[PDB]
Design a binder for this molecule. Sequence first.
Ligand SMILES: *P(=O)(O)OCC(C)(C)[C@H](O)C(=O)NCCC(=O)NCCSC(=O)CCCCCCCCCCCCC
Ligand code: SF4
Ligand code: SF4
Lengths: 60, 80, 122, 237, 242, 186, 185
Amino acid sequence: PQDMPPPGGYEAVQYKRNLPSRGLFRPRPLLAGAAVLMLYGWYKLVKGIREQNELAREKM
Amino acid sequence: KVEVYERIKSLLAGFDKVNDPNNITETAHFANDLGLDSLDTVEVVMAIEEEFSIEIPDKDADQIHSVDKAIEYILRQPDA
Amino acid sequence: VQPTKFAVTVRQSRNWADAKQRVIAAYRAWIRAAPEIQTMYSIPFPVSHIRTRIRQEFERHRYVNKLNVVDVLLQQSNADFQETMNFWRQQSHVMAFFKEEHFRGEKRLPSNFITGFLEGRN
Amino acid sequence: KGKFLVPGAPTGLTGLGTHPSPRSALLYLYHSTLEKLKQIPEHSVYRQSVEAVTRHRLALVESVVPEGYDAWVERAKKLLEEHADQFDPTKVGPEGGEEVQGARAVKVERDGRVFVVSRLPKEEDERVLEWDGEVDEGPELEGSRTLEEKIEGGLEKIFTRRDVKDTVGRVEWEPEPQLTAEQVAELENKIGAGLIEEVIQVAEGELKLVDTMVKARVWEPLEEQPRPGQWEYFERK
Amino acid sequence: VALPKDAPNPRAIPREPVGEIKQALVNPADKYQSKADNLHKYGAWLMSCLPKYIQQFSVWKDELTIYICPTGVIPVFSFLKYNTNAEFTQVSDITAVDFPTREMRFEIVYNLLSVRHNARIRVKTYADEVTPVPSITSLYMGANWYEREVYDMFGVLFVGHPDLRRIMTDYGFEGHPLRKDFPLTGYTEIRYDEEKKRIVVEPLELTQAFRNFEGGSSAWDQVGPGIDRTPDTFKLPTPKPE
Amino acid sequence: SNAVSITKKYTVQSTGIWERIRRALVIDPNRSNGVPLNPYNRNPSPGDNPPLEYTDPVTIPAGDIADNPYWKRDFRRNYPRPSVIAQAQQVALLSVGSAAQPRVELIGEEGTKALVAAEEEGKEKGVAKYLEEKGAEEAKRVLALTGGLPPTPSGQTMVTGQWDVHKYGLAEEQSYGGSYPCRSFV
Amino acid sequence: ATPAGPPPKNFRLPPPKNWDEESESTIDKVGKYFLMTEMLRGMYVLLEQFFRPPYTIYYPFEKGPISPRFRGEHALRRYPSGEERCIACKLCEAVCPAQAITIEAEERADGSRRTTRYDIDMTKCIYCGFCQESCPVDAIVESPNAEYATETREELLYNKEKLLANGDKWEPELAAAIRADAPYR
Ligand SMILES: *P(=O)(O)OCC(C)(C)[C@H](O)C(=O)NCCC(=O)NCCSC(=O)CCCCCCCCCCCCC
Ligand code: SF4
Ligand code: SF4
């Protein structure tokens, strides 16, 4: 015979724009994250430079 | 005015299409006197043009048919 | 010259007084331009040879007594002028207008009967 | 909210923006077209074709009337009558004046009908507008100057122009009421040629063709016959 | 290889056998008779509205052609650009055809499109080696380069055109290649000259001469005369007997 | 959404722990990687497709042995001619009508000489002289052929069965939604 | 610009929305600006490719796929007997789109109709395959060989001694490709 389609036809293929929104790139979870990172870092820095200043008092 | 003749006069002396030198006067006509053709005129005026470092417009170049007309155009141009 | 530097809108000569005015203005521009053509295209000829050769190309059509024939011959000139004054033509096209830069040279037809016979029609 | 079309809002077609007054523009163009058709003889099919089509569209345009139109037109009739010299093309030019920062109108007559062409000063941001938009011709010539130089500098315009705030001898021309956005849609469903703004583009094309159709006298007999064997190709038999 | 597991082999599926295939015979010209009457009507209306220039009109299938005087170019294209029933606002193509057996060698063919009416129209005029044609770049900006091609390839000259220069050929090229007297391989060839250090231009020699197999055209005509297909609305009424 | 499951997409799949890893750290789990399947794609090659399986078909009318004379199906030699009408022809058509619709009965004799009266006037005078001299009354008649308006040109679709413009309308569902400056048209 | 008849239902755009009519929270709008979230998504798609198999083929050890209909360099074939199939009809010379074939024939010593010249300008040929569709004896074919760059273009003037040598070389593969595609020809 010839090259013909299957008896019931081929199934539908995906052709529409899919592009699904992910939480990883939405602004609200990222804004919250960047903020907690800077707040944790600012707590760690405020403790370190206090200790550094006290080490300097002992050195002097 | 004596120079603008002297430089033009020697120029036509070397121009070959001039029928014969010594026919060059203050009022010499390019066609009647010198026997220069319609396209020999343009060649002459171009030599007239370049020697004095000025560009002749078409509206003015069509007027340059006699030597005296050539003189009165070059005097009117401030540069030389 | 709106679209290009040396563009001229295609015009049809109104009469012989007009048609001769345009021819003379065409010849004037070409022989004016000969120094500018000789430096850009590095033509190894005198400006005088260029000008005398420009004259020949107008001397070919001196006996045209048709006004419709002059306008096409004028448009051809204007277009040639535009492509030469803009550096659009290559040195190869320009110095190929001089018919002595063939390795056979200007002498390319046989001179008379006998010399073309001994060479097989040149 | 959406009762009226924003003027100059995009239509969907790029470069074509919503007409400020679509109905009167179309009426002006049709009547102007009908007036130039009298330069053409009656027996030309061109004129009959343009006349019939133009009158057909002119009838449907006039079929819709903006609300308050009868009320507005009565005031506008009087407002023209008592202040005619304010809107006269022979007095204030084809433009309604030279003070482009002020309102400009002119009464124009076409084909037994009266129109006012009002040109409105452009709405610009106050943060960018210098001198309320008064055009800058440059500085005045100062110093020792000649009589001729002062004239070419515009000095005689002192005794002609007016302060834009100077509105005592003048009256404000009030614009015509517009169609609604739904009325415009109904106009479109009658004429059957797409968007109203796109119909004005075609309509002002018919106006320009009459000038070329008269200059060329297209109704005159054939100029150049086909000489024999001109449109003959390669047909057999 | 990890198979998709719910995407089976599309080749493994068996196909329902096709037996006797039957196709009706159609004459593709027959689909165009329903519009044959209006295409004639539109061409008849056009030449009554512009009797000064429209010499004739032809209709082949879906194509209406208008034949015009060369001096009518600006009026005719204006009417076909700015008429409300002739809203032909695109030039699709302008080209020439050469007929050296005619006194006017060149036929100028314009193809126009009306997006408003989903319609096409062809306009034909004529030109010569010296007889110029009006340019229509006053009406269609897109026609500018087309006329440069017709000029470059045929020598036809377009009065009014801004910058009518060559568009296709080389800069010092002499000749018009689409002319039927112009030879296929031209008259000149180029090469690099070592002794001159540039590319030079030479008279044409071909290592193999071009073999033209035109002589093998059938001694017998193979198409015949065709069939007349004019609407009865554009035929002359016949005189009934008695 | 618009996606269909990866399991129906005829690409190589990730398996086991790597499938769980992929379906976690990936934008769209239903997206394929574009790698085709060896047991399915171009398998077998066209060089191993059996020569004897394929059949070159004929259709019954044109390919039969017993009920088709070639000259019924020679549509190349039944090609339409171009139908040409010049200015002389249209003068006659307006003068005396058309085989579809005559202006005069043209019965027997003294109608044949009226049929050249149409043809003779056509050569002598264009459609322009003809319209000038019989007045603007028959300028109205040229439009009376198409109902009093000029005719509009023919469209080129026939999807509705009649030649017409295509009715371009907005599709029911837009592919970008209103979110992008691009509309979809059906 | 739109078709004749009624304008399309809602062809005209809606009126434009002012900035404060837009439906996008300032938090979402400002975050997407400063965090550059859509650019972050695209960089993530390149990480996805990084961990996918490449498409590359190691050539010349692995070759790309070619069909039985492939159009490579020409060959002149024989019969099982050993006689050349070519009988000098010149059909392949008439149909050549680029005039790349030059054939001179005469009567062979035994009276058979055979070519004396058979040249193919491999630098004129467009590899259309027309020459092999027109053959009545399958004499001229195009082998699947695409790897024959040469040094001089004199090597690209195939004469009848090279085209027969090619057919002798490539016959199994030529017979195989013909066997696959003959039903469709
Ligand atoms: P005088 O009155 O004697 O002559 C004036 C003319 C010549 C106008 C005649 O009176 C006349 O009427 N002759 C017929 C009109 C005529 O000359 N027709 C043609 C004019 S156009 C023409 O001749 C163009 C020539 C070629 C232009 C280009 C020349 C230079 C090209 C190459 C330059 C060098 C390489 C870049
Ligand atoms: S190869 Fe085939 S087509 Fe060509 S000359 Fe020989 S028999 Fe004829
Ligand atoms: S494939 Fe080459 S040789 Fe064969 S017909 Fe085509 S161009 Fe000529």
